Protein: N-acyl homoserine lactone hydrolase
Organism: Bacillus thuringiensis serovar kurstaki
Amino acid sequence: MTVKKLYFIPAGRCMLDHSSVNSALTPGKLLNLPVWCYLLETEEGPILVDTGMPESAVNNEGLFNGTFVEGQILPKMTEEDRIVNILKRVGYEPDDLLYIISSHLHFDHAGGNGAFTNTPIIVQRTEYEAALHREEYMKECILPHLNYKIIEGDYEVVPGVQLLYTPGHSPGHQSLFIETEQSGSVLLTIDASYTKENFEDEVPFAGFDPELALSSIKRLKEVVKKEKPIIFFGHDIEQEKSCRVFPEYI
Ligand SMILES: [Zn+2]
Ligand SMILES: [Zn+2]
């Protein structure tokens, strides 16, 4: 069985210093990077991958003023980018969803998790445990009473939807390998590589453990050598130019 439709859904944006996509660059220039969620229409029901930024980021570029990351992260989020609004426009309410998949619990990926109080939220144990104590993590991304479906390592969500454990960018980061009806094998690196250059050329980028992130890239390259998928990266301004986005699908 294959996934019926894979949708790339813009979920607002976020400014990061350009050293975030290339650690060798000298800090001083911000990049307006895309924030994504993905919607998978499957035989078993719709599945949402990531949930955008938290309510606190709405019309609040200075969210991280007063913190250890002041001026280094500026969310670009409007009321329209709240995940429930995104879903409502697409044609879903939170309780319609079969699963939420959290690639990781960074604020640009799990900020909307609180909206889903019934749907199982699939997240790596190592990411969940990290989010409990590491300072990067926002409280909005680790709410205690959500219906977490905690997994460890690789995992098949439904036929055609595979999670690949790719730690490094964050302690329990996971990527997706999807088989779609229209396109066949698709690799969503999520933040296992922000840009094509991080993947192909192994250019270092923002992450908790760069060494581990490299090994996760090498692991993904082995998958690619075997499966020859089309590959989409996490925060790639260049690639975004040519991405088929909602209402188009792959
Ligand atoms: Zn991240
Ligand atoms: Zn990210």
Notes: Residues 1-241 form a domain with the Metallo-beta-lactamase; Chain A fold (CATH 3.60.15.10). The pocket of zinc ion (ligand 1) is lined by residues 104, 106, 169-170, 191 (CB under 6 Å). The longest strand covers residues 5-17. The chain has six helices and twelve strands.
